[PDB]
From Swiss-Prot:
Cystines in this chain: 4-19, 6-14, 13-36, 27-33, 32-57, 45-64
Task of the protein: Inhibits platelet aggregation induced by ADP, thrombin, platelet-activating factor and collagen. Acts by inhibiting fibrinogen interaction with platelet receptors alpha-IIb/beta-3 (ITGA2B/ITGB3).
Protein name: Disintegrin rhodostomin
Ranges in a coiled coil: none
Organism for this UniProt entry: Calloselasma rhodostoma
Shown residues within the full chain: 408 to 475 of 478
Domain Disintegrin residue range list: 1-68
Amino acid sequence: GKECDCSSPENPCCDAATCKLRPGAQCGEGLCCEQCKFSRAGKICRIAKGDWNDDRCTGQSADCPRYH
């Protein structure tokens, strides 16, 4: 977006000075953002709405799209 990677100032994954991520982790907030680290693919970011495939995250992303 602009120059920020997180939305919380207390979050330990984004320099509060530049409201951006902290140069050490790889995600300040997302459906698949591990403790300051890019979650690994095969991450269930959300469950379908009945009975079928589920939502999985990649090995380099920190958010989750939609498929159900």
